[PDB]
Design a protein around this ligand. Structure first.
Ligand code: DUT
Ligand code: DUT
Ligand code: DUT
Ligand code: CR
Ligand code: CR
Ligand code: CR
Lengths: 131, 137, 129
């Protein structure tokens, strides 16, 4: 029941929002219009930056509707947004369809952002495991 | 440690009930209610014959099965599939054959993916003019 | 503060480490050299095995740099490391670029590992919703 500081690098876009209570993420908009040819990819700017709390992590997930209907996916899915990252959030989209192209319009919801805690583990090297 | 329960409805009473192979196993395997064949590069939305009630504050995640991933190149377009807490519909998996030549034959009753459940920070967005001005440089 | 036991099966690679305080994961290296032609995949060794605490889960995430740059992805992303597992972590790399083959050399960072709690939920069958 955390707050996430967000800066709208592109004031021309709506502020990402949680569709329904409980909804895992908030949809991210595309700041640009782009066409992905079958098999081709693209790094798309979302017009936003966020400040994920220390001990937490941002996760860029693909939208299931578009995923099925047009084969639109994310190459590095899940996208990993570190707590210290202050740059702009970009989504590496890819058209996984075999023959049809994917049209992306400035203003479309091209991904969803989730926020979860993360175990900042201290790795301790051992000679072997206990059995 | 001691968690909660997850209410599950077998929409298709012909498939087994998903379960946790081992105690510490992150998730439970989901079965395919249908027979499907994925030609190379082709995809499909396959039904799992189940619906769930992910508790408020938690999310359901649909991950691929490493085995089939390596052996035949089976993947899931929207991995990780996000199952929202308020969703009460049937879980479906967007299976895709990432292999270059060999089709992939899916049989009703096969384990096609696994489902994990985690808590999820239901963050409240707070727009700020800039990180510097907000003291977040 | 949670600690993660880890064995460098291949003593010739650096121990995986967290780039910055706050960074979600730690980059896992490649223990071998591999070239993936377009559309081709390969299960790569990392030269390490870990011991995910009971109640937690490991997760293998692709690195965004290479994904955008050369189209390098992970077939089963996110890779699930169960608490029970004690074998070598292997990554299922795949070349999603149309024409350019991908070259990986021993010592490269091919993936990042995350650890998170997981709800070991108890399934209960019910009649309806
Ligand atoms: O592997 C999946 C992913 C999603 N769903 C369902 C359940 C759920 O929460 C809803 C929507 O998924 P999502 O929010 O990812 O995709 P969307 O394209 O953004 O659609 P929606 O507009 O309904 O939010 O779709 C599944 O059955 N299986
Ligand atoms: O979909 C994404 C993925 C990552 N990032 C940013 C935020 C963040 O945490 C940082 C690095 O992501 P990552 O660790 O995946 O890529 P990398 O290639 O491993 O590089 P690095 O950690 O070296 O900066 O890059 C995005 O804006 N969008
Ligand atoms: O990116 C990955 C994913 C899995 N593994 C290993 C570790 C681990 O837990 C085991 C396989 O568990 P998993 O649920 O992924 O595979 P499965 O296909 O569902 O099969 P099962 O539990 O029968 O093995 O494989 C990796 O090394 N890398
Ligand atoms: Cr939604
Ligand atoms: Cr398993
Ligand atoms: Cr990093």
């Amino acid at each position: 029941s955390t707050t996430l500081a967000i800066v709208r690098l592109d004031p021309g876009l709506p502020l990402p929002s949680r569709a329904h209570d409980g909804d895992a993420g908030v949809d991210l908009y595309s700041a640009e219009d782009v066409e992905l040819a079958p098999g081709r990819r693209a790094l798309v700017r979302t017009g936003v930056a966020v400040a994920v709390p220390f001990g937490m992590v941002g996760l860029v997930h693909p939208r299931s509707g578009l995923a099925t209907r047009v084969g639109l996916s994310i190459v590095n899915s899940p996208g990993t947004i570190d707590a210290g990252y202050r740059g702009e959030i970009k989504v590496a989209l890819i058209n996984l369809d075999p023959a049809a192209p994917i049209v992306v319009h400035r203003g479309d919801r091209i991904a969803q952002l989730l926020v979860q805690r993360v175990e900042l583990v201290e790795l301790v090297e051992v000679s072997s495991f206990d059995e």
